[PDB]
Write a protein that holds these residues in place. Structure first.
Motif, mmCIF file in Angstrom:
data_model
loop_
_atom_site.group_PDB
_atom_site.id
_atom_site.type_symbol
_atom_site.label_atom_id
_atom_site.label_comp_id
_atom_site.label_asym_id
_atom_site.label_seq_id
_atom_site.Cartn_x
_atom_site.Cartn_y
_atom_site.Cartn_z
ATOM 1 N N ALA A 114 -8.214 58.615 33.580
ATOM 2 C CA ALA A 114 -9.187 58.062 32.640
ATOM 3 C C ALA A 114 -10.586 58.022 33.246
ATOM 4 O O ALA A 114 -11.556 58.497 32.638
ATOM 5 N N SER A 156 -14.046 60.068 32.367
ATOM 6 C CA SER A 156 -15.361 59.438 32.269
ATOM 7 C C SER A 156 -16.365 60.119 33.195
ATOM 8 O O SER A 156 -17.513 60.375 32.809
ATOM 9 N N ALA A 195 -19.887 44.454 41.481
ATOM 10 C CA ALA A 195 -19.344 44.254 40.142
ATOM 11 C C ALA A 195 -18.549 45.468 39.679
ATOM 12 O O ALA A 195 -17.465 45.326 39.100
ATOM 13 N N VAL A 196 -19.065 46.663 39.927
ATOM 14 C CA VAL A 196 -18.370 47.885 39.556
ATOM 15 C C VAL A 196 -17.492 48.333 40.718
ATOM 16 O O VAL A 196 -17.717 47.978 41.878
ATOM 17 N N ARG A 197 -16.467 49.120 40.397
ATOM 18 C CA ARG A 197 -15.484 49.539 41.383
ATOM 19 C C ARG A 197 -15.571 51.041 41.636
ATOM 20 O O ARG A 197 -16.009 51.799 40.764
ATOM 21 N N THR A 218 -11.491 44.868 38.807
ATOM 22 C CA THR A 218 -12.344 45.660 39.691
ATOM 23 C C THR A 218 -11.669 45.927 41.033
ATOM 24 O O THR A 218 -11.746 47.042 41.563
ATOM 25 N N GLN A 249 -12.704 53.180 28.959
ATOM 26 C CA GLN A 249 -12.717 53.345 30.409
ATOM 27 C C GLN A 249 -13.696 52.377 31.066
ATOM 28 O O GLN A 249 -13.429 51.864 32.158
ATOM 29 N N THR A 289 -12.517 48.990 32.244
ATOM 30 C CA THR A 289 -11.644 49.084 33.406
ATOM 31 C C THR A 289 -12.414 49.117 34.719
ATOM 32 O O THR A 289 -11.792 49.031 35.783
ATOM 33 N N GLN A 290 -13.741 49.248 34.675
ATOM 34 C CA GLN A 290 -14.555 49.277 35.880
ATOM 35 C C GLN A 290 -15.631 48.205 35.928
ATOM 36 O O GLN A 290 -16.150 47.931 37.015
ATOM 37 N N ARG A 291 -15.979 47.596 34.798
ATOM 38 C CA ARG A 291 -17.017 46.577 34.758
ATOM 39 C C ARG A 291 -16.402 45.204 34.998
ATOM 40 O O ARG A 291 -15.415 44.838 34.353
ATOM 41 N N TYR A 292 -16.986 44.455 35.928
ATOM 42 C CA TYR A 292 -16.483 43.126 36.245
ATOM 43 C C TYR A 292 -16.655 42.192 35.054
ATOM 44 O O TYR A 292 -17.639 42.271 34.315
ATOM 45 N N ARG A 318 -14.867 42.151 32.370
ATOM 46 C CA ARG A 318 -14.446 42.776 31.122
ATOM 47 C C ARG A 318 -12.985 43.175 31.242
ATOM 48 O O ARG A 318 -12.631 44.007 32.086
ATOM 49 N N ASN A 369 -10.445 36.220 30.932
ATOM 50 C CA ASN A 369 -10.277 37.623 30.580
ATOM 51 C C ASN A 369 -9.119 38.302 31.293
ATOM 52 O O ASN A 369 -8.537 39.235 30.738
#
Lengths: 237, 196, 237, 247, 226, 238, 204, 237, 222
Positions: free
Chosen positions: F79, F83, F124-126, H8, H114, H117-120, H122, I5
């Protein structure tokens, strides 16, 4: 706690995150040597290429930020490329805002300011890559500077970064303490023999990539295989 | 094309205003009241463009009432006039300037009666007497001729009737009735409306 | 465990519960209806010789026909009065008819509910209560819990000792004992007088006579009403 | 137990705010006494290291407006910004209404901003409590004390320092309303400062005092310089000597 | 959270750790003399590979404002850049006052973005400011969290305690002429480990004529006969 | 471990970013891939697990077309891989809109690697859980092939492999003599190498997605005609 | 035109260790006078005054905003404003509204707090400073004040004669213009005193 | 387990745990099957009923005349996805007057899902989608998991105990292209009936059918419309 | 876990399984949708006599053809009811017709979870072209059509009783008595007119209060 987990001051009065990033520079298995001479400044780093399926044409760690300034990167390659891109953007933006080309010291200062912003705050993290940038500067001769993940931009004459940077710095300190200026044969040979004594492999003229900036000839010359082979033959004579 | 007038006596302010609202060919309300009770002792007059006058006068009145409720003591007439001018001047340079023409009067326990004049540009000024509108050009001369700083309430009413009769005799648009209110130490006192 | 504005495993909202229990720290507040007058009292007992009693402001007006009293945190209460007063002046600006007691109580409850919503805002640890004559003659009393809600009460009894005073009110809330303004005032007294010592001048009563302004009872008349209450207590052996 | 600022307690207390307000008692010392035809502030100079120059001309006492002055007793970092905001609020009111801002309105605005700071967001409460002395047309000379909780109070003789309990007890014992004058207020302030400061015979350098007086239609906020302060000290010393020897 | 933060009951623990960090090891003494102010610091570079004319410890913020600092030099660069921008903005707003000493107090006050808006992590540098455009000199210190102190003589190094003790015992005094730089060098000597030289010691002086970072020639001249 | 491998912004005591060190594990766990630069082009090839026969003909294909002459063969978390492929398509479109002509492969790889590094830099992002090869050919610049790790940087590859069995594929890749073999036999050989890599020894039956770019296709990176490359699959089977 | 909407005429001149600022006290729309006690000279300090000419609303707005900024600066610093610094502050405040300029032409007249050096300057609507040592004026009839001053001014003039000259110039100028007049206010600033005089002027 | 707390964070063993938990949202849901044919696409959904008094809830949501979806799992962030798909399809109609092809819509859904799946902060969209559409290449059936990794499928089922339906579809998927509309619908009904325990059986009130074809726009058949298909059930519970 | 969440390790995110069990603290409410109309019965549960019964209201008319009964945090129900009114009025203004109760419930469900999730359950009831209808909306942004629904602290017992006392062809007269007897069985006190609120839904009538203390004609039969 979280004193050693985030970019916050330790109870003892230290900053452990950047202290870890500096060791992150050591992580990666590479070394670089920068030597300023009487009229030129040369930088050489080993080219660790595992297997020949890689393209030795593009595995380099040295780049041209502008027409007269060249960097060499030590540490994680992703952060190294990001900082190289940032330095190129800064050089171009300086040339656009100010007509004359950006001095190498000012470029190092700007990169170090960016790194200091990174070690500030807590959302981001410092980039684990130490950049040594050289370039000819009028009324100053050759100039060499180092910007670190903390933001302390300094370094001159002979400066090294990498895993075995301490031994290289010690040998270069011995050489510079020996009071004799290096011409554009002795500076290159001094750098080559320094990196060879650090890692004794005799340096077949394919595993290192040297960048040179002289005064009579400007620009960051990434010397080819023939030039490095000729310098190696002259040194081992 | 409206009319406002105010006279500052030794211990009072006598203000009169016309009671007509029109649509450029015809007046549709002979009982129109443009007195705005800002506070217990502060009174405002606001003429000019339709709606804009209502909006500005109402907003300033409600801010003054909010101040009175929030501090227990009402604003001084000088402070109210300065606040009104400041708001109007702030709105003037904005995208939606308020083309309102004002005549603010009030009484204070310490400085006595007060009268203030300002225009759509929001240029505040304090005068013992001030007529306002197209009738100002007709009655300012009578005011200056027959006014002294020691005019009593009856003499003030006499002078106000004089200038209103001059307006009725000489001005083009009919102004059959006027609303007369006097401000003094006891508070807001309204007098019998003057008609012809 | 968890004490933030999130649902707990058993339900409820523990931060909201803590705010609702914070009104206990504060002072008593009583007030009644009667179709002739609404009167509410606080009975503050803390005045040092060096503090001015003017600025205690336990009861305040909104639009000269609506008044509210404190029960809980004073700073939060004062911010509530400021915002509510601004909103009453707004609802006087638009909708030219004067504000109704139910409308302003609804606005206060909505503000409290909004502040309870989301984690950022502390849930306004103040329990307000509002009396006043509406535009259509009928005087009303509403009491607003800090969380989000308001309720129209005949007697409020909010603050320290709320349970006992509310029991006393609901025990003998006689409309025949309400009748006259003086009867209403004397019913509020001997009910608020019951709370703590109430000896010399602790009672701080307030009065709203139909269309009159907010009347704050003078201390000498308060002592006169206390004496009348004592006289009623007498001859009852 | 403490956490992010916007919390409560299982009982229902704002223990972070209470801890900050109690910490205000720690460090710093200011006191305000209100008298007729003049209201004054007395401040304790904490650090008297000889290596300073005293060029700022004021550390605790701050002139915030033509008709008022304050004195902080908290951390200086928040104190500076709070004083700047207070001056800004006063001058904004002066611009809007063309009239000096009433002291109560100014104090309510400042305590509103402090209540907002302790109310919403992940922001620390302003760990500073300050007094205010001033004059207005409505109430004349006024004195106010505001705590970091945002709950100000209209006082007439109060202290906000370390030994604030001892200072306020000494005030209550030797405070007489009505009969009080500017000179008697000075004497009482110096006496209570000598009481709350352990070292007797306080030097004029370790004490900074400012008096607000009403001249002819104009408010004068004079900070008492070294010579006048030590002359007051000498008069107080004479009074103490006479009182002690006359027994 | 995103400001100066971490203040428990009665304490500023994060600020206290910042103050422990600024203890540093660079003395950077400052002396306010009658004629002017001297800010002298120690540049003890690791080995001879580093250069002394490349980076500087004393930075002229404006015409007669000079600046010396303490630990966390990378933070100090951003702080001095901000100070230069703030002084330039003040001079542009209030055009042509030649603002140095009527600005030294002001620029020290506007050192509130320095700490009162910490930026998650507070600055770890304490800086001394000198200015002399008022007919009188000024020496101010701004710490990682506080504000102007208006010093007359102080040190901010590893041995700042004994440095300040030496300053007071040697009687920083008030009648001392502009050449109190000798006493400043002596105070550095107490907190110095080695034979200090012209490149090893960097000092700037701010007199009524202006501010000037002394070149190695004059630094060596003063260091001679010590 | 423990408190240091929680966010990418937290450096290890030794100076490492464990979040990316774990993101590389997802690539190591997912199916393998191979891309070989032939003499006059670049040939891709990826085996895909048909986890269930309920699926139609090869879908969610590991091969993607990021630009007219550029293709991406990705492995890892699919996935985020898609992206990132969309990001690469947007980058190529933006470059074509701004500077005209076609985006050089080295610059495209550098830009996408910088974007990936930006995603792995913050907290915050991975970091992206995918590794991919970008292959393209042009008459002017010949054939290039750059491979991007989930956190690393693009590197020039004569022939590269990523996924479950990197070393096993790379051994036979280095055994194969490139730089003089036409892209046809390179298609045959990449199919041969993939079938040499274990397919059904412990997994289900695998499908062979093979891609093409070169002068034989005048650029224009397209999937090889599967009907005529089934015989290449047959030769690989033998 | 627009600058002549409400009229106005403000004068400032230099004497020997003393300054003088004068202005008309008329306010009104194009043709009529509304009041004869309008304020156009505002005290920024004990020995420093400002005069504004233009739209009366812009006059009052500039005066109030400048007083606000000056009070803030005085509170921040604690030392009295220098007249050059205040002229600079006025220039910046005017330029902050470059494309929406306040239609005023401020002038500065005062003495240095310590050296007692006279200082007189003028500014345009945008905020260009014009610092001189003889005289500046502003308003609808600035040319009339120039013509009067170029012959009535004498360098190194005593405060009495300076007042006489400024009064003569203002009176004649407000007599020869059609929009300003009906009373002249003049302030004489010495090293220790302020002399405020209301001249006997043609009230028409 | 620390590493399973947030989306994350990355597990040391490989793939992250929050998304793996997200796939359990579709697992904990009413079963639904969807199969392709030569010319038609049919969805058979189990309308799970709370109680006999309440209705059997709503499944097989409507998107456009040629596209219809069936949800399975977290119904909260499922109407959101339905709104997104409706908006995208209507945008396609508005821009170039053609039915948005199902593959492009599914790619858009995958890209949109998608990012969470990467934003903290969410959560991933824990919804299983069985999209049925008829583009120009015949009917299409797509499965969208919360992992944002969509799949194309000849016949796929999702929900509780859906493995039995998957096995039945796989065993009978060979005879799917050459089947009449009623025959394919009966295949789907038999597949869904095999999911529930033997006690449960297909009823007109607890089943929903979504059919899209070449000449037949997407239609949601229920009890009266399902009865002609429900006949000839060949009931073997 | 604790994050609003983050999903649970097993199947379904928490802090919304906590929000749904907020009708447990809420009071009981029951609604019956018959062919005649919809009967909405709730308890006021007054704590003290001094509080006005008219103040405590759990049934509020969203519009002339929609009635809503709340069960849970009245503060959150106020916001939800206000949003329902705004949406209904906006739809009527846009399309000049009466918004369907199903559409209103759908909009309120959309606004239910978009901020910590609302913890109230609503029983919408009103007339439309598809006869009288009743919908049960739950705190977890989910709505279901129902014919006879119970909600509140004892929703289980009330719903179980309603499951066997309800039949598909009942009228309003039987529905009100069934709801009232069930309510009396659930509650602690008796079904006094000052404690029980009732709302009626009619095809040809707006939804008004149930006779306002003259409704004893329905509780005397009980």
């Amino acid at each position: 706690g979280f004193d050693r987990h985030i970019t916050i001051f330790s109870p003892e009065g230290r900053l452990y995150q950047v202290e870890y990033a500096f060791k992150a520079i050591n992580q990666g298995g590479l070394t670089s040597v920068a030597v300023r001479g009487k009229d030129c400044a040369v930088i050489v780093t080993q080219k660790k290429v595992p297997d020949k399926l890689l393209d030795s044409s593009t595995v380099t760690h040295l780049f041209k930020i502008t027409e007269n300034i060249g960097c060499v990167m030590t540490g994680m390659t992703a952060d190294s490329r990001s900082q190289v891109q940032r330095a190129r953007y800064e050089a171009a933006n300086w040339k656009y805002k100010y007509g004359y080309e950006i001095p190498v010291d000012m470029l190092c200062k700007r990169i170090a300011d960016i790194s200091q912003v990174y070690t500030q705050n807590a959302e981001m993290r410092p980039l684990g890559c130490c950049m040594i940038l050289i370039g000819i500067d009028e009324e100053q001769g050759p100039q060499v500077y180092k910007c670190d993940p903390a933001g302390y931009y300094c370094g001159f004459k002979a400066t090294a970064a990498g895993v075995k940077q301490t031994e290289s710095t010690s040998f270069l300190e011995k050489k510079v303490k020996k009071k004799f200026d290096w011409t554009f044969e002795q500076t290159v040979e001094t750098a080559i023999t320094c990196l060879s004594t650090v890692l004794s492999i005799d340096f077949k003229p394919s595993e290192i990539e040297v960048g040179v900036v002289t005064v009579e000839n400007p620009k960051f010359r990434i010397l080819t295989e023939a030039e490095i082979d000729a310098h190696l033959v002259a040194l081992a004579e | 094309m409206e009319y406002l007038i105010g006279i500052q006596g030794p211990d009072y302010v006598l203000v009169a205003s016309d009671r007509v609202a029109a649509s450029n060919i015809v007046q549709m309300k002979d009982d129109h009241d443009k007195m705005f009770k800002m506070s217990e002792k502060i009174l405002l007059l606001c003429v000019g463009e339709a709606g804009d006058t209502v909006q500005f006068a109402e907003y300033i009145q409600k801010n003054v009432q909010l101040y009175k409720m929030r501090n227990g003591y009402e604003l001084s007439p000088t402070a109210a006039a300065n606040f009104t001018r400041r708001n109007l001047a702030d709105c003037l340079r904005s995208r939606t300037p308020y083309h309102v023409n004002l005549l603010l009067a009030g009484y204070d326990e310490h400085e006595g009666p007060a009268l203030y004049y300002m225009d759509y540009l929001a240029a505040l000024a304090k005068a013992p007497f001030a007529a306002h509108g197209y009738g100002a050009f007709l009655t300012l001369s009578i005011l200056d001729r027959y006014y002294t700083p020691t005019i009593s309430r009856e003499r003030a009413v006499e002078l106000l009737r004089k200038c209103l009769e001059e307006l009725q005799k000489r001005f083009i648009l009919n102004l059959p009735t006027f609303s007369v209110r006097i401000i003094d130490k006891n508070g807001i006192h309204d007098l019998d409306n003057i008609s012809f | 465990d968890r004490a933030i504005t999130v649902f707990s495993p058993d339900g409820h909202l523990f931060q909201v519960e803590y705010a609702q229990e914070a009104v206990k720290k504060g002072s008593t507040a009583v007030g009644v209806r009667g179709r002739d007058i609404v009167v509410l009292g606080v009975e503050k007992k803390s005045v040092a010789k060096l503090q001015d009693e003017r600025t205690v402001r336990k009861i305040c007006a909104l639009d000269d026909n609506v008044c509210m009293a404190f029960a809980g945190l004073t700073a939060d209460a004062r911010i509530v009065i400021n915002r509510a007063r601004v909103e009453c002046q707004s609802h006087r600006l638009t909708v030219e008819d004067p504000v109704t007691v139910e409308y302003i109580t609804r606005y206060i409850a909505s503000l409290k509910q909004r502040y309870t919503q989301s984690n950022g805002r502390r849930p306004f640890g103040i329990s307000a209560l509002i009396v006043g004559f509406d535009f259509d003659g009928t005087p009303r009393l509403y009491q607003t819990d800090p969380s989000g809600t308001y309720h129209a009460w005949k007697a409020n009894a909010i603050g320290r000792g709320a349970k006992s005073v509310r029991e006393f009110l609901e025990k003998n809330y006689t409309d025949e004992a309400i009748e006259t303004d003086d009867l209403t005032i004397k019913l509020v007294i001997k009910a608020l007088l019951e709370v703590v010592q109430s000896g010399g001048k602790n009672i701080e009563l307030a009065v709203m006579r139909r269309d009159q302004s907010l009347k704050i009872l003078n201390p000498e008349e308060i002592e006169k009403y206390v004496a009348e209450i004592e006289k009623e207590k007498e001859e009852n052996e | 137990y403490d956490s992010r600022t916007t919390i409560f307690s299982p009982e229902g207390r704002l223990y972070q705010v209470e801890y900050a307000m109690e910490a205000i008692g720690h460090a710093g010392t200011c006191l305000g006494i209100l008298a007729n035809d003049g209201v004054l502030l007395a401040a304790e100079r904490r650090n008297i290291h000889k290596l300073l120059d005293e060029v700022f001309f004021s550390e605790k006492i701050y002139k915030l407006n033509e008709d008022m002055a304050c004195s902080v007793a908290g951390i200086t970092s928040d104190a500076n910004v709070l004083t700047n905001e207070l001056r800004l609020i006063a001058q904004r009111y002066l611009l809007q209404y063309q009239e000096p801002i009433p002291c109560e309105q100014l104090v309510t605005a400042l305590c509103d901003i402090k209540q907002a700071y302790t109310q919403f967001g992940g922001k620390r409460p302003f760990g500073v409590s300050l007094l205010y002395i001033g004059w207005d047309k409505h109430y004349g000379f006024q004195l106010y004390q505001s705590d970091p909780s945002g709950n100000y109070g209209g006082w007439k003789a109060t202290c906000i320092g370390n030994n604030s309990a001892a200072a306020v007890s000494m005030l209550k014992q030797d405070y007489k309303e009505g009969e009080m004058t500017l000179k008697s207020a000075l004497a009482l302030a110096i006496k209570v400062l000598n009481k709350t400061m352990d070292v007797s015979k306080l030097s004029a350098e370790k004490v900074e005092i400012a008096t607000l007086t009403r001249e002819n239609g104009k408010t004068v906020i004079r900070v008492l310089k070294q010579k006048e302060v030590e002359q007051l000290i000498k008069k107080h010393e004479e009074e103490e000597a006479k009182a002690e020897r006359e027994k | 959270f995103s400001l100066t933060t971490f203040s428990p009951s009665g304490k500023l623990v994060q600020i206290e750790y910042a103050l422990a960090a600024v203890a540093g090891g660079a003395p950077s003494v400052g002396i306010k003399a009658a004629n002017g102010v001297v800010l002298a610091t120690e540049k003890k570079q690791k080995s001879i590979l580093y250069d002394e004319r490349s980076v500087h410890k004393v930075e002229p913020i404006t015409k007669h404002i000079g600046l010396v600092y303490s630990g966390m030099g990378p933070d100090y660069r951003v702080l001095v850049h901000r100070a230069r921008k703030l002084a330039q903005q003040y001079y542009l707003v209030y055009q042509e006052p030649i603002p140095t000493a009527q600005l030294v107090q002001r620029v020290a006050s506007v050192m509130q973005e320095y700490t009162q808006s910490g930026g998650v992590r507070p600055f770890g540098v304490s800086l001394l400011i000198c200015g002399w455009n008022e007919g009188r000199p000024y020496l101010f210190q701004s710490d990682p969290s506080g504000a102007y102190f208006a010093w007359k003589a102080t040190a901010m190094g590893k041995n700042y305690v004994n440095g300040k003790t030496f300053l007071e015992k040697r009687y920083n005094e008030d009648l001392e002429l502009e050449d109190a730089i000798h006493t400043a060098i002596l105070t550095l000597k107490e907190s110095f480990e080695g034979q200090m030289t012209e490149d090893n010691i960097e000092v700037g002086i701010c007199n009524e004529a202006g501010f000037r970072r002394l070149t190695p020639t004059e630094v060596k001249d003063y260091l001679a006969a010590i | 471990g423990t408190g240091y491998d929680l966010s990418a912004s937290t450096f290890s005591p030794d100076g490492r970013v464990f979040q990316v060190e774990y993101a590389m594990k997802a690539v190591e766990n997912s199916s393998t891939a191979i891309g070989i630069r032939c003499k006059d082009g670049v040939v891709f090839g990826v085996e895909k697990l048909v986890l269930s026969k309920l699926y139609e003909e090869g879908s969610n294909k590991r091969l993607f077309n990021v630009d007219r002459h550029v293709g991406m063969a990705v492995a890892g978390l699919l996935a985020d891989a898609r992206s990132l492929a969309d990001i690469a398509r947007e980058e190529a479109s933006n470059f074509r809109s701004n500077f005209g002509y076609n985006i050089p492969l080295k610059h495209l790889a550098d830009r996408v690697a910088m974007y990936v590094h930006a995603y792995t830099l913050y907290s915050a992002v991975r970091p992206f859980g995918c590794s991919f090869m970008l292959g393209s050919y042009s008459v002017n610049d010949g054939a290039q092939l750059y491979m991007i790790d989930p956190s690393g940087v693009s590197y020039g590859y004569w022939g590269c492999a990523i996924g479950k069995a990197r070393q096993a594929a790379k051994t036979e890749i280095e055994k194969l003599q490139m730089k003089e073999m036409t892209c046809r036999d390179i298609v045959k050989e990449v199919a041969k190498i993939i079938y040499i890599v274990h397919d059904e020894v412990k997994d289900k039956a695998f499908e062979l997605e093979l891609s093409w770019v070169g002068e034989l296709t005048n650029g224009r990176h397209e999937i090889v005609p599967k009907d005529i490359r089934e015989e290449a699959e047959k030769y690989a089977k033998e | 035109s627009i600058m002549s909407y409400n009229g106005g005429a403000v004068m400032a001149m230099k004497g020997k260790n003393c300054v003088a600022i004068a202005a008309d006290r008329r306010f009104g729309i194009q043709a009529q006078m509304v009041t004869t006690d309008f304020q156009k000279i505002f005290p920024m300090g004990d020995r420093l005054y400002i005069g504004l000419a233009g739209l009366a609303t812009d006059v009052q707005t500039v005066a109030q905003r400048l007083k606000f900024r000056l009070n803030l600066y005085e509170l921040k610093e604690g030392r009295q404003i220098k007249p050059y610094t205040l002229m600079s502050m006025v220039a910046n405040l005017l330029y902050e509204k470059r494309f929406g300029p306040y239609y005023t032409e401020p002038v500065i007249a005062g003495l240095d707090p310590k050296t007692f050096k006279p200082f007189i300057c003028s500014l345009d609507l945008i905020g260009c400073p014009m610092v001189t040592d003889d005289f500046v004026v502003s308003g609808t009839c600035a040319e009339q004040m120039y013509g009067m001053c170029e012959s009535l001014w004498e360098p190194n003039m005593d405060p009495d004669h300076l007042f006489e000259t400024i009064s003569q110039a203002m009176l004649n100028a407000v007599d020869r213009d059609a929009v300003s007049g009906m009373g002249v206010i003049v302030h004489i600033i010495e090293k220790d005193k302020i002399t405020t005089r209301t001249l006997k002027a043609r009230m028409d | 387990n620390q590493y399973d707390n947030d989306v994350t964070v990355w597990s040391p063993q490989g793939r992250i745990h929050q998304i793996e938990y997200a796939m359990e949202a579709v697992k904990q849901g009413s079963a639904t099957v969807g199969l392709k044919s030569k010319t038609h696409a049919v969805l058979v959904a189990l309308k799970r009923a709370q109680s006999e008094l309440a209705a059997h809830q709503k499944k097989i949501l409507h998107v456009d005349n040629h596209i219809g979806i069936s949800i399975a799992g977290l119904t909260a962030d499922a109407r959101l996805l339905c709104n997104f798909m409706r908006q995208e399809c209507l945008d396609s109609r508005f821009v170039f007057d053609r039915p948005l092809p199902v593959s492009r819509l599914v790619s858009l859904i995958g890209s949109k899902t998608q990012i969470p799946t990467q934003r903290y902060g969410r959560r991933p969209y824990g919804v299983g989608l069985l999209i049925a559409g008829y583009d120009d290449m015949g009917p299409h059936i797509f499965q969208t998991c919360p992992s944002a990794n969509y799949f194309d499928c000849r016949a796929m089922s999702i929900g509780a105990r859906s493995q039995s339906a998957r096995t039945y579809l796989e065993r009978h998927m060979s005879e799917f292209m050459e089947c009449n509309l009623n025959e394919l619908v009966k295949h789907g009904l038999r597949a869904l009936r095999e999911t529930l325990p033997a006690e449960q059986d297909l009823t007109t009130k607890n089943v929903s059918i979504g059919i899209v074809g070449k000449d037949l726009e997407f239609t949601i058949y229920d009890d009266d419309d399902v009865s002609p298909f429900l006949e000839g059930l060949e009931e073997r519970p | 876990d604790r994050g609003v969440n983050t999903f649970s390790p097993e199947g379904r995110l928490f802090q919304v399984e906590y929000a749904i069990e907020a009708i447990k603290l809420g009071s009981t409410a029951i609604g019956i949708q018959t062919s005649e109309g919809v009967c909405l019965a709730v308890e006021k549960r007054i704590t003290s006599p001094l509080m006005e019964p008219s103040s405590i209201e759990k049934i509020v008319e969203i519009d002339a053809h929609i009635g809503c009964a709340m069960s849970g945090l009245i503060a959150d129900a106020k916001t939800l009811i206000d949003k329902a009114r705004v949406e209904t009025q906006n739809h009527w203004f846009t399309y000049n017709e009466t918004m369907t109760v199903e559409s209103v419930t759908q909009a309120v469900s959309n606004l239910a979870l978009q901020s910590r999730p609302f913890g109230v359950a609503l029983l919408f009831g009103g007339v439309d072209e598809k006869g009288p209808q009743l919908f049960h909306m739950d705190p977890s942004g989910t709505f279901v059509q129902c014919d006879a629904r119970a909600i509140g602290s004892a929703s289980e017992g009330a719903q179980s009783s309603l499951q066997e006392v309800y039949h598909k062809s009942m009228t309003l007269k039987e529905a009100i008595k069934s709801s009232l007897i069930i309510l009396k069985q659930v509650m602690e006190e008796k079904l006094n007119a000052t404690n029980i609120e009732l709302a009626t839904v009619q095809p040809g009538q707006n939804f008004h209060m149930f006779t306002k203390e003259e409704l004893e004609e329905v509780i005397k039969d009980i």
